[PDB]
Design a protein around this ligand. Structure first.
Ligand SMILES: [Mg+2]
Ligand SMILES: [Mg+2]
Lengths: 98, 95
DNA sequence: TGTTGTAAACAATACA
DNA sequence: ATGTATTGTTTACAAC
């Protein structure tokens, strides 16, 4: 299993919208990607740093506080509705080999 | 009065190097910092979590198992031998 | 030029 | 109160 032809943001977007209510925890994001693209092993922290970096930089990823009744670590991440259609449209557009 | 121009790793190097056996317990590290740099008050625990985090993170600081000089307050912390000299020279390099 | 990949510095927060 | 792991923000620079 090799490195998929997608950017980290595209992968985040793939994972986020593939979730029941379209929102995930950082953890959830790592799980989705590692499950559907084994290349990214949960033991390599490299790409994970990359995921976090993309969540913060890219302005279209919004953080959602955990309900007070379910106090876990880290919040929920979801696509900004404003650009959801844009991001989702190209989330699966494979890119030319890097 | 004002936040010193040093990282937490630097303050720690400062504090340990300053102790006699050249080693300190977290508590000792805290007290050294707020005594020399009043800005850090034992009231704001923000920087204190930082100190504990920096101790665990940095492969620069080694944890020494404590015997019984205190059956109620953690281990001792001293600087990595191979890098001690480098750190000492950098401990006060304002950044 | 504008975008994406990596690495890392540096904290905040959760929690064992 | 001690100590460690995760989660998040932000820079700097390389690769595309
Ligand atoms: Mg964001
Ligand atoms: Mg350590």
């Amino acid at each position: 299993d090799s490195k998929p032809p997608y950017s980290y943001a595209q992968l985040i977007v793939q994972a986020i919208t593939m979730a029941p209510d379209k929102q995930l925890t950082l953890n959830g994001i790592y799980t989705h990607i590692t499950k559907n693209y084994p290349y990214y092993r949960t033991a390599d922290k490299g790409w994970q740093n990359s995921i976090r970096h993309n969540l913060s930089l890219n302005r279209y990823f919004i953080k959602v506080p955990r309900s007070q009744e379910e106090p876990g670590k880290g919040s929920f991440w979801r696509i900004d509705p404003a650009s959801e259609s844009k991001l989702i449209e190209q989330a699966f557009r494979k890119r030319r080999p890097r």
